[PDB]
Amino acid sequence: IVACDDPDFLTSYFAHSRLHHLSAWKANLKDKFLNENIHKYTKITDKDTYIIFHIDFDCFFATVAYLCRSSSFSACDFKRDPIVVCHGTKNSDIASCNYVARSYGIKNGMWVSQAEKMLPNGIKLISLPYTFEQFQLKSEAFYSTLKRLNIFNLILPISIDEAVCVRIIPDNIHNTNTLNARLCEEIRQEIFQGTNGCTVSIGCSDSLVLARLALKMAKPNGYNITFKSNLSEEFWSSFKLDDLPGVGHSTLSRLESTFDSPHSLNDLRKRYTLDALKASVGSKLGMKIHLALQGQDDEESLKILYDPKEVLQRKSLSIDINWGIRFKNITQVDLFIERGCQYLLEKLNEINKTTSQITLKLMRRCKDAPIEPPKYMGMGRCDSFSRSSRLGIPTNEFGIIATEMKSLYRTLGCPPMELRGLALQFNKLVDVGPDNNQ
DNA sequence: GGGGTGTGGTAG
DNA sequence: ATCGCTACCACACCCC
Ligand SMILES: Nc1ncnc2c1ncn2[C@H]1C[C@H](O)[C@@H](COP(=O)(O)OP(=O)(O)OP(=O)(O)O)O1
Ligand SMILES: [Ca+2]
Ligand SMILES: [Ca+2]
Ligand SMILES: [Ca+2]
């Protein structure tokens, strides 16, 4: 039990937080891409022709947590039991669940107590603990396999368990689906072997957006090849609106309110007009969804193909702690800001950078919300407040940054006992080169 | 056109 | 108990 006023809190929270791990793993994968390719341009151009293989472990955490589960939990079958990965017993997030559990309607992000109610009396919910180190070792095997194949002009990391692999098809060369299905089946089999029993699915197409939908269609433990030329009403009628990239819960609600609750991408595409779409969800997102409904990528999503090094370059750096924040006085808040600043500066120094703009953001208990929320140590219902500050010259100096961060906190007027969450952000970073003279 | 701010949204 | 992170894109409204 490490409390937020304990010097070890940040270490212990990050050690347990799957969302921290996902974000740290992604950041390390992007920096490794930059280093591996530091002397390899490997350029893709608008005139070039390519195929995308979008590869993703099926229920990654649940599959690995099961394969490596301790003897305390020997009594469960992956193919017949509803398995979830989570920390606790009641208001604890399901990090991952297996397709059996999903068959009952259970979803990642659900609380355990909610997913228990969805099980007909008789079947038992099996909760496995996280196995963070093994998640990363299986991932290592995965990215190693992908590299060893020497069949992709570009291997873009998406997350610990997900990558977008680009193969250039030269104008002279003739591609067949015979070749694609075999590349698909090789990848799936090598990864199954290299990871001791983990399965991936694969979407294969000639746009990023379609490969993504093809991969959704292929799950679980399969692969799907759907090119622009293969599009059909049958295909579109198989997807929900929030299967589209960029359509999260708020965009879904606006789409359902605007276009009379479509229930498939076929409904949406038979009903929309571009302008009504941009009116409902925004101009750029509107155009993106419009092009997506043709199977086509937008300008922003193509940039990762044309200049992946610019895209994967880190432009800001931050920490967010919105769980376990219970402080009594301004002294302990200041100490915590200081610990956060030191952590962020250690990271900033590891990447040889300075920052010229910082932000403090906080979560303050809603005036009518309970002091202790439903979730143990949760932030509960909160109001967000944020303030930023431009520095004089770029810096990595703790005295400048931590003092300004503590000043920013004071300007937001949040009593320490009402504090439920803090983010510390370095919004602009500057390169440190060999010449640091004035 | 540029830059400025604080907020909202998405994603594994 | 329980570990509700974090990068980056977009927008609204603001300065001349
Ligand atoms: N909040 C979260 N959002 C997404 N993934 C999360 C989250 N918390 C934990 N995870 C885990 C679930 C996975 O094991 C891993 C990668 O996420 P993701 O690929 O979306 O899910 P998944 O592999 O369990 O299911 P799917 O087969 O649908 O991809 O991260
Ligand atoms: Ca996955
Ligand atoms: Ca994934
Ligand atoms: Ca989506």
Side-chain angles (χ1 to χ4, degrees), chain A residues 230-417:
Chain A
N230 297 138
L231 290 185
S232 60
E233 200 159 35
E234 181 204 353
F235 179 79
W236 292 117
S237 79
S238 313
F239 302 97
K240 302 192 118 207
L241 267 54
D242 54 350
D243 287 332
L244 266 193
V247 180
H249 94 95
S250 173
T251 301
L252 177 61
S253 313
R254 294 180 193 270
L255 288 182
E256 287 172 328
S257 163
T258 292
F259 299 105
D260 198 22
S261 322
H263 299 288
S264 85
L265 292 180
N266 193 64
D267 289 0
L268 182 56
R269 83 191 303 260
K270 277 158 72 209
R271 296 186 190 177
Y272 84 107
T273 75
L274 173 52
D275 255 54
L277 180 50
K278 302 154 102 191
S280 172
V281 301
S283 163
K284 315 221 191 293
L285 181 53
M287 179 71 47
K288 172 183 179 72
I289 292 170
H290 165 56
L291 298 166
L293 283 162
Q294 330 288 325
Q296 282 176 31
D297 295 313
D298 65 315
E299 197 142 58
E300 193 63 29
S301 57
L302 286 171
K303 300 185 178 205
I304 197 181
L305 303 172
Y306 300 150
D307 313 78
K309 284 168 157 153
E310 292 283 82
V311 170
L312 299 191
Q313 210 78 44
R314 179 203 275 295
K315 299 162 264 292
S316 57
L317 173 67
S318 79
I319 58 168
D320 296 62
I321 305 91
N322 298 291
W323 182 91
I325 297 317
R326 305 287 190 277
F327 289 110
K328 295 200 121 73
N329 50 65
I330 194 68
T331 295
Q332 298 306 314
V333 174
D334 277 356
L335 289 183
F336 185 76
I337 294 172
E338 278 164 30
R339 298 182 189 114
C341 282
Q342 174 187 60
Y343 173 94
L344 279 175
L345 288 180
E346 280 161 6
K347 296 301 163 196
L348 185 76
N349 288 340
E350 290 169 29
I351 63 183
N352 214 39
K353 288 196 193 325
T354 52
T355 183
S356 64
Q357 177 187 39
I358 66 182
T359 294
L360 192 138
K361 165 168 181 324
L362 60 84
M363 291 317 278
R364 170 188 192 170
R365 182 193 61 89
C366 283
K367 255 136 185 202
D368 71 341
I371 297 176
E372 284 318 301
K375 188 189 192 88
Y376 172 62
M377 282 298 183
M379 63 170 135
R381 274 177 33 248
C382 290
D383 299 306
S384 185
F385 301 83
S386 155
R387 222 214 147 111
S388 63
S389 163
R390 296 270 173 170
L391 307 188
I393 59 167
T395 185
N396 60 359
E397 266 153 51
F398 172 92
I400 295 161
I401 290 165
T403 296
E404 185 60 13
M405 284 293 201
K406 284 184 299 194
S407 190
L408 285 168
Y409 181 87
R410 271 148 188 80
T411 76
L412 291 177
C414 178
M417 286 176 62

Side-chain angles (χ1 to χ4, degrees), chain A residues 56 159 161-162:
Chain A
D56 181 57
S159 70
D161 73 329
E162 182 171 352

Side-chain angles (χ1 to χ4, degrees), chain A residues 6-40 43-46 48-220:
Chain A
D6 194 299
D8 293 337
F9 177 73
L10 211 60
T11 298
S12 163
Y13 180 53
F14 282 169
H16 294 88
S17 165
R18 99 261 199 199
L19 289 166
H20 168 70
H21 277 90
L22 289 169
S23 283
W25 283 329
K26 195 192 173 102
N28 304 337
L29 282 166
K30 291 157 126 183
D31 179 69
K32 178 157 172 176
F33 173 92
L34 296 177
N35 296 330
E36 292 193 323
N37 294 275
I38 184 48
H39 298 136
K40 290 271 142 168
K43 233 27 120 104
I44 299 195
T45 59
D46 64 356
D48 293 328
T49 288
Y50 46 87
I51 186 167
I52 312 295
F53 296 75
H54 194 137
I55 312 177
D56 181 57
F57 281 80
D58 298 283
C59 44
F60 178 61
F61 282 9
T63 299
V64 179
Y66 175 78
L67 278 177
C68 317
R69 86 207 181 273
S70 72
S71 70
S72 284
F73 305 88
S74 297
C76 50
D77 187 59
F78 201 55
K79 322 242 157 205
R80 310 189 210 157
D81 258 319
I83 316 284
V84 305
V85 180
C86 59
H87 288 295
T89 54
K90 181 170 79 149
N91 295 330
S92 169
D93 280 10
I94 285 146
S96 179
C97 48
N98 69 343
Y99 280 85
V100 164
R102 292 167 196 215
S103 81
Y104 300 109
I106 284 159
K107 275 71 171 54
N108 295 6
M110 265 199 188
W111 284 356
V112 157
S113 47
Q114 188 183 352
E116 292 180 336
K117 291 157 156 174
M118 303 189 77
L119 291 162
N121 250 303
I123 319 107
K124 206 63 101 212
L125 185 57
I126 298 323
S127 307
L128 299 178
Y130 300 80
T131 70
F132 285 122
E133 292 315 299
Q134 275 282 20
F135 300 151
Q136 165 171 7
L137 292 172
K138 301 317 201 189
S139 178
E140 279 177 5
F142 168 81
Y143 279 94
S144 180
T145 301
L146 299 184
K147 207 208 302 214
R148 184 182 319 130
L149 305 170
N150 264 4
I151 62 187
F152 295 120
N153 307 89
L154 191 55
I155 300 172
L156 304 168
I158 296 319
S159 70
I160 191 76
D161 73 329
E162 182 171 352
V164 161
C165 296
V166 190
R167 183 178 171 83
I168 286 147
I169 311 292
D171 286 325
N172 50 279
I173 267 297
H174 182 252
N175 179 262
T176 83
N177 278 351
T178 313
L179 193 72
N180 300 332
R182 307 258 48 88
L183 302 161
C184 278
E185 286 198 11
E186 178 189 355
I187 292 153
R188 273 161 49 69
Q189 170 54 217
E190 309 268 305
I191 295 179
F192 190 77
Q193 187 259 331
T195 73
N196 202 270
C198 307
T199 78
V200 303
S201 310
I202 304 177
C204 173
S205 176
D206 45 5
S207 83
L208 294 165
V209 59
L210 269 197
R212 204 155 288 104
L213 294 183
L215 159 73
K216 271 146 159 22
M217 183 164 270
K219 288 182 166 329

